[PDB]
Write a structure and sequence with these properties.
One of its GO terms (biological process) is rhodopsin biosynthetic process. Keywords: Disulfide bond, Glycosidase, Golgi apparatus, Hydrolase, Membrane, Metal-binding, Signal-anchor, Transmembrane, Transmembrane helix, Zinc. One of its GO terms (molecular function) is alpha-mannosidase activity. The chain has 15 helices and 51 strands. It is α+β, with helices and mostly antiparallel strands. The protein has 5 domains: about 375 residues, 7-stranded beta/alpha barrel (Alpha-Beta Barrel), CATH 3.20.110; about 110 residues, Glycoside hydrolase family 38, central domain (Substrate Binding Domain Of Dnak, Chain:A, Domain 2), CATH 1.20.1270.50; about 150 residues, Sandwich (Immunoglobulin-like); about 280 residues, Beta-galactosidase, Chain A, domain 5; about 100 residues, Immunoglobulin-like. A 12-stranded mixed sheet has the order 25-24-31-32-33-34-43-40-39-36-37-44. Strands 26, 27, 28, 29, 30, 35, 38, 41 and 42 form a 9-stranded antiparallel sheet that branches. Strands 14, 16, 18, 19, 22, 45 and 46 form a 7-stranded antiparallel sheet that branches. A hairpin with a 5-residue loop joins strand 27 and strand 28. Helix 13 packs antiparallel against helix 14. Bound molecules: 2-acetamido-2-deoxy-beta-D-glucopyranose, the ligand CS[C@@H]1[C@@H](N)[C@@H](O)[C@@H](O)[C@H]1O and zinc ion. Ligand MSN binds next to loops.
Length: about 1000
């Protein structure tokens, strides 16, 4: 294994280093507005060294943006694909690249057989080429690496099955900035090349100047370079035709033959295209070749990539003709005029890369190495695209919920082969596809029109219901005596209970377990643990009586705590935000202990009075002017008092002190220790009254944030043996700090209401001497060092926080883990901040044509880990990565992949069993089985099950922490006959494994394995 901590990679371009050196001046470069006037030597190209030009036709098709997926499919994409098929069939020389498999699959399945065959033939013959081959072209900022993989696999599995092709070149022209998570996954999925486009205009200028726009992109910790993937960054402002022929868009626009008038398009530079004729072809070619030779100066080989396309292009037959015929006249002239020394033709993306690497092998060029990312993007001036790190945060949180439910459904159902009538494969395919669709760069980003957001939400809701059905059928099969098991595949044996989605105050969607002497004495509940190690976690359920006790399936008592059910109400009469208690529903909380990738059953039983092993929380309501708060049978009366500072400690864990407004002020780790200042504060950013306005994409604050005026908020303290909390009703946020004996959990019920032109931020203020350094993650995969740059505006110092961020000095670290992607930063030493929601009246002029006014209540979740790090073995000051500790990593897992809870729906579960998976290996804590997926249907003689294994890297801080077991995924199911290492999509076998044993992976590595079973 490579050491990912102690060896700083030597690379030609390291993006943090480059950022520190660059000036970011936005000067007028002339016709290339963000560059300079490119010069070339006409003698560079000659009869023995020609410029090879590949014109690559393409059409960018968003799976939802202004229209829904289906609306675009009906109005545009089905015609584009139908006309591509006809035109490429009839014109053997014409080429076209296609990216979005969600659309292609929808189209292909609707084709008659004769046309399916024609389509297969133009792909087989190389005219139509798939690039990337994912279900979508995903966002790279907010997406979790697990879901980027899921959608890539969904599209490529479809392509292998129906087209018989697996792309090895990736095309990502539209995500708003770029992540090294992409080359990481692609390179482990058989890819050899990738292309990107939306990077900061200053970065394009800088790399262009050094001919570093093509580079071998390796991971920031990779000293050897085995993660490296060849990457091509396009040089200009857009991928449209005006910005792809060369530096001068007034010229390139004249070579977009759809812009002459009849298609309702024109050139903003006020010079139109003209149809190519024998009388103008020479002068037109003079102009175009000069653009091409200018572009070619920015690159190292004699092979030039010229994309030819734009959004939803190549729709009309007459459009295919006008582009093809005019380009063909140009090619015939140029290629026959030796003085140009150019050979130009239509080509595909792969053809481009193959010729580039042929030039490389001939010794004509060597490429620089690069590590780092390409956030935060700005396309011009101070317009930084950090708003979409937060836009539509309800659906951002929904993404992470569905992410986990898809994993749990695939894993629970993977243990068995299912009859087709169970509709398991059907429901799993729907769930994967709707989650995969939402990875689109207008889905999770929150940059789609309101009605499209609705469509993505409805699709995800159906996906959640699909996952629940599969999960609950799987639990029933796994925990029922086989000779008793009698499934109705349409029946609901269990319902899922989820405490944090949609979350209390977002939906009264939690079912109460109804017990009573005259109806039902007891209820079975089951917990699933998708992680491959034993896990204990507190779980809660609503019950109809406070007098409930818990047993395990050996009838051993389990310690439990009952608390009231509190709901917060904005009282339009008294103009206060205050909590109400239920007088008929209560919460019971107990510690569940669940095997690795396993299940554990418990029983809740009512009694007529307080049970021996159940305790009751106290409750203290702090406000002036209190009124009574009855709680039915709950055995402890609520107490009242004026607002005051309070301190809490659960178990032997930290002691937390809170201000009289209910906000954290300090954390004391142990009995002896300092009360370390750690202050939560809520603030608001506004919008500029003159100049550019914030919108779905752009964050353009009118200065630093101002504190939210809190008034005198109502504070509720619940103190229990197992769980305590402080909750406060602030304007727009019910803010909750929950303590279970370790790092607290924070929950914010965020309802920005009708506060127009407002962004609500949650800030942590500490005295940690972090200076200008902080760390944020990329796609939940890795943590990258950030440096706050005062030479850039505030919004440029915002980065994606897809799952966590931290600051540290020599002694102390504070880590905030998230259950949803949001934007954030550290705008001053000792600070962390993360945006909660944003409501914007204005559009930001990128084409969406609306502001963001469709906010809805969202429950954001966090864990907050304050730790001593003076003993941790950390990377050197020059290393671009950072790494979590064990506690911070486990805290992240508790948010992203909590225990699943199932409530038995009927009165009696006959043949019920107490546990599944007690014999599963309990793997080392840094190892995860990210995916478990059965790959075969029940009719296959040879069953195959796929596993993705990911090992993170955790800091060595002096904890001996050992005693675990080797996890060999290939032996998890019986009767193994073969074990293969595969690409991460499972589509190609890479290694036939000795003894049928899947080795564990190295820190920061991910591998896939497929086990084959004869049973
Ligand atoms: C699928 O592609 C491979 C590539 O070598 C080819 O050998 C095989 O015959 C193809 N199967 C078909 C034509 O369906
Ligand atoms: C950023 S403009 C971009 C458009 N190019 C469109 O494809 C959609 O993705 C929108 O967000
Ligand atoms: Zn797009």
């Amino acid at each position: 294994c490579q050491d990912v901590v102690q060896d700083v990679p030597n690379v030609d371009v390291q993006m943090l280093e480059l950022y520190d050196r660059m000036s970011f001046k936005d000067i007028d470069g002339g016709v290339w507005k963000q560059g300079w006037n490119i010069k070339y030597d006409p003698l560079k190209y000659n009869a023995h060294h020609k410029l090879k030009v590949f014109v690559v036709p393409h059409s960018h098709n968003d799976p939802g943006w202004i229209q829904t997926f289906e609306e675009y499919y009906q109005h545009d994409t089905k015609h584009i694909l139908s006309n591509a098929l006809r035109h490429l069939h009839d014109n053997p020389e014409m080429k076209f690249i296609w990216a979005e498999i969600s659309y292609f699959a929808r189209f292909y399945h609707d084709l008659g057989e004769n046309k399916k065959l024609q389509m297969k033939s133009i792909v087989k013959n190389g005219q139509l080429e798939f690039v990337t081959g994912g279900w979508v072209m995903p966002d790279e900022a907010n997406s979790h690496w697990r879901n980027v993989l899921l959608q890539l696999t969904e599209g490529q599995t479809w392509l292998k099955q129906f087209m018989n092709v697996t792309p090895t070149a990736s095309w990502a022209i539209d995500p708003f900035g770029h992540s090294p998570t992409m080359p990481y996954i692609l390179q482990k999925s058989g890819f050899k090349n990738m292309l990107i486009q939306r990077t900061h205009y200053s970065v394009k200028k800088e790399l262009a100047q050094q001919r570093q726009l093509e580079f071998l992109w390796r991971q920031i910790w990779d000293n050897k370079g085995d993660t490296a993937l060849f990457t091509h960054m396009m040089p200009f402002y857009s991928y449209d035709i005006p910005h792809t022929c060369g530096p001068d868009p007034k010229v390139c626009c004249q070579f977009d033959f759809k812009r002459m008038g009849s298609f309702g398009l024109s050139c903003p530079w006020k010079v139109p295209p003209r149809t190519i004729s024998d009388q103008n072809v020479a002068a037109r070619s003079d102009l175009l070749v000069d653009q091409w030779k200018k572009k070619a100066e920015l690159y190292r080989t004699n092979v030039l990539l010229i994309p030819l396309g734009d959004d939803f292009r190549f729709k009309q037959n007459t459009e295919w003709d006008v582009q093809r015929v005019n380009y063909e006249r140009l090619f015939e002239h140029i290629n026959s005029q030796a003085h140009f020394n150019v050979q130009a033709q239509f080509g595909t993306l792969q053809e481009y890369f193959d010729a580039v690497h042929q030039a490389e092998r001939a010794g004509q060029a060597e490429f620089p190495t690069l590590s780092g990312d390409f956030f935060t993007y700005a396309d011009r001036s101070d317009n930084y695209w950090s708003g979409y790190y937060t836009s539509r945060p309800y659906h951002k949180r929904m993404d992470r919920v569905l992410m986990h439910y898809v994993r749990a459904a695939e894993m629970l159902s993977a243990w068995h082969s299912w009859d087709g009538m169970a509709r398991i494969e059907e429901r799993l395919e729907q769930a994967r596809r709707e989650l995969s669709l939402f990875q689109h760069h207008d889905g999770i980003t929150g940059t789609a029109k309101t009605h499209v957001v609705v469509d993505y939400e409805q699709r995800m809701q159906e996906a959640l219901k699909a996952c629940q059905m599969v999960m609950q059928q799987s639990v029933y099969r796994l925990l029922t005596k086989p000779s008793i098991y009698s499934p109705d595949f349409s029946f609901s044996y269990f319902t899922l209970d989820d405490s944090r989605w949609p979350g209390s105050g977002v939906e009264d969607s939690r079912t109460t377990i109804i017990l009573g002497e005259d109806i039902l004495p007891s209820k079975h509940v089951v917990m699933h643990n998708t992680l491959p190690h034993w896990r204990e976690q507190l779980v809660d359920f609503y019950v109809s009586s406070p007098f409930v006790s818990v047993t395990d399936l050996a009838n051993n008592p389990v310690e439990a705590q009952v608390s009231p059910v509190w709901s917060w109400h904005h009282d339009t009469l008294t103009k206060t935000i205050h909590p109400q208690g239920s007088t008929t529903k209560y919460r019971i909380i107990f510690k569940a202990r669940v095997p690795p990738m396993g299940l554990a059953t418990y029983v809740l039983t009512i009694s007529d009075s307080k049970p021996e092993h159940t305790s009751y929380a106290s409750n203290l309501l702090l406000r002036k002017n209190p009124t009574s708060l009855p709680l039915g049978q709950y055995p402890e009366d609520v107490k009242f008092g004026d607002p005051r500072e309070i301190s809490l400690r659960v178990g032997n864990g930290p002691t937390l002190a809170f201000s009289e407004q209910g906000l954290l002020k300090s954390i004391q780790l142990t009995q002896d220790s300092p009360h370390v200042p750690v202050h939560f504060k809520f603030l608001k950013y506004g919008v500029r009254s003159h100049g550019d306005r914030s919108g779905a994409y752009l964050f353009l604050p009118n200065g630093p944030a101002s504190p939210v005026e809190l008034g005198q908020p109502v504070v509720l303290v619940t103190k229990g043996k197992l769980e305590s909390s402080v909750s406060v009703g602030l304007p727009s946020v019910v803010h909750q700090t929950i303590m279970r004996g370790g790092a607290p959990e924070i929950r914010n019920l965020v309802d920005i209401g009708s506060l127009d032109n407002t962004e609500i931020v949650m800030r942590l203020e500490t005295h940690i001497d972090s200076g200008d350094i902080f760390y944020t993650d990329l796609n939940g995969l890795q943590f990258i060092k950030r440096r706050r740059l005062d030479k850039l505006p505030l919004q440029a110092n915002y980065y994606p926080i897809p799952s966590g961020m931290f600051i540290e000095d020599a002694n102390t670290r504070l880590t905030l883990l998230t259950g949803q992607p949001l934007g954030g930063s550290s705008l001053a030493s000792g600070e962390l901040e993360i945006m909660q929601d944003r409501r914007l009246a204005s559009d930001d002029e990128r084409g969406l044509g609306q502001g963001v006014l469709d906010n809805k209540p969202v429950l954001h979740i966090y864990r907050l880990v304050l730790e001593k790090v003076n003993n941790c073995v950390r990377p050197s000051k020059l290393h671009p990565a950072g790494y979590l500790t064990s506690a911070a990593h486990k805290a992240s897992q508790s948010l992203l992949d909590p225990l699943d809870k199932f409530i038995f729906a009927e009165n009696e579960w006959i043949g019920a069993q107490g546990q599944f998976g007690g014999d599963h290996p309990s793997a080392r804590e840094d190892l995860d089985v990210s995916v478990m997926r059965r790959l075969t249907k029940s009719s296959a003689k040879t069953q195959r099950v796929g596993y993705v294994l990911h090992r993170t890297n955790l800091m060595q801080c002096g904890t001996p922490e050992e005693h675990t077991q080797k996890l060999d995924v290939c032996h998890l199911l019986p009767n193994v006959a073969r074990c293969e290492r595969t690409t991460l999509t499972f589509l190609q076998n890479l290694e036939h494994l000795d003894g049928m044993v899947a080795p564990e992976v190295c820190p920061m590595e991910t591998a896939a394995y497929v086990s084959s079973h004869s049973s």
